[PDB]
Homo-oligomer: A and B are copies of this chain.
Amino acid sequence: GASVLVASNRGPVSYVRLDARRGGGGLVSGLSAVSSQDSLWVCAALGEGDREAVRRGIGEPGVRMLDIAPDVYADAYNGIANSVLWFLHHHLYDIPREPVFDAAFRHRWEAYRAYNRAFAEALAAAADEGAAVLVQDYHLALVPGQLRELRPDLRIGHFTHTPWASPEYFRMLPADIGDELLRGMLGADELGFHTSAWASAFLSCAGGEQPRTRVRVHPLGVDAEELRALAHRPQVDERLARLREEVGDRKTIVRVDRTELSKNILRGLLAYRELLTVHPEWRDRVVHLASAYPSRQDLAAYRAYTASVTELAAEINAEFGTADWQPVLVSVEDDFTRSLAAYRLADVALVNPVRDGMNLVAKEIPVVSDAGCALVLSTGAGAYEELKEDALTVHPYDVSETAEALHTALTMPPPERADRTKRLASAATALPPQRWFLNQLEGLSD
């Protein structure tokens, strides 16, 4: 019997041939405020090692891991969730070719239903009378509706971490699919989003007027003390020292995002090319740090995006580079110690996604900046509504405006830059992970 339950595809522990491997994060932090004698976290076995753990009865106290059939899991999680819903909500489809709702899609939708149902049955079995249930993200959007039918006594929350598709865009789904998805989520007493634009979009898709479901905005932020302590370890100090050597005495424009289609890395690079073309005074005087670390390697479009990032970076280096200067410093590692050092050094942060739910990098950088950092932020970034007073606004498709914002950011008077950096840090730490989580739990008392 649990009185507080969480459901997410990914739980706190992963097992490998068995050894246990812990990932932290927002949910670990949030549940650490809840009595561990009263909570249960339901999650999925992510691969063979996790399924073996479940097979042997090996598992963490307060965690229930579900063995969902590998082909049903692939079709639900990689198929519908991470391809079809991810693309829908981020507006990423190449309209002449995708989406395609065919017989195979329908088969994969049936698995998505069955994947969600395994979670709903687990929660239904474990939850005390009137328990609070917090369902996390688009993977489990049918759970609230399924679980409402099994257990009308439960208090059910669901939080979407992505954007929500605009109503016109959402109507690409066949009507029966769209409608099943909306009913799935409308089973909740409370639906949460990071921003009111995402919340409004969901509300418009539902037709307005959904009186049993409270729609709310809980924008996730950062724990200042925790991030600062990590950023000031000697390993970061060391790596920062090496990074200053690599950059030289030059200014920095920093990003660290993986090559995900919504991140808008290419147009960012194009804006950098135009900056160096139009404002030649920056040649030998600035370096753009960017990542070409792959987001995904199992879709053709994602592999082509990563390759285009690599190639465009190399074109810019060949055009403007000298023996002493590399204009784009490309990282292909995923090393958080290096990112923290990049955050500490940054003169300019380039956070220009087409659309996103909440990129925390916009919040993380100002919190750890050693001497101030100007933020170039797109209107589609989830952090936009909270940070727009002290960031330089850019419209994500507008490369010329993005190039000009880089110039304004690079020339921002140092005391203005500090005042902005301090106000950005304040807004960024308003709702750390633990209070973000507790507000959702509190919302289920409403």
Contacts and interface: CB of A to CB of B under 8 A. Distances in A.
A126 interface: no
Interface size for chain A: under 10, 10 to 19, 20 to 34, or 35 or more residues?
A: 35 or more
A204 to B, nearest CB: 11
A274 B103 contact: yes
A401 B174 CA distance: 9
Interface stretch (A10-18, A92-100, A248-256): A92-100
A206 to B, nearest CB: 18
Contacts of A264: 96
Interface stretch (A1-9, A63-71, A392-400): A392-400
A106 interface: yes
B397 A106 contact: no
A243 to B, nearest CB: 29
Interface string A188-220: 000000000000000000000000000000000
Copies of this chain assembled into the complex:
2
B106 A262 contact: no
Nearest to A173: B397
A297 to B, nearest CB: 16
Nearest to A302: B96
Contact of A91 (B95, B100, B277): B95
Given A166-B168, A168-B168, A262-B96, A270 B400 contact: no
Nearest to A308: B97
In this complex, the member of A261, A264, A399 whose beta carbon has the largest number of chain B beta carbons within 10 angstroms is A399
A227 B401 CA distance: 51
Contact of A95 (B92, B105, B278, B403): B92
Contacts of A106: 400
Interface in A238-277: 261-262, 264, 266-267, 270-271, 274, 277
Contacts of A324: none
A294 to B, nearest CB: 15
Nearest to A263: B96
A101 B305 contact: no
24 contacts: A92-B95, A93-B95, A96-B261, A96-B262, A96-B264, A96-B301, A96-B354, A97-B266, A100-B267, A101-B397, A101-B401, A102-B270, A102-B271, A102-B274, A102-B399, A102-B403, A103-B274, A103-B277, A103-B399, A105-B400, A168-B168, A174-B395, A174-B401, A175-B395
Interface of A: 91-97, 99-103, 105-106, 166, 168, 172, 174-175, 261-262, 264, 266-267, 270-271, 274, 277-278, 301, 305, 308, 354, 395, 397-401, 403
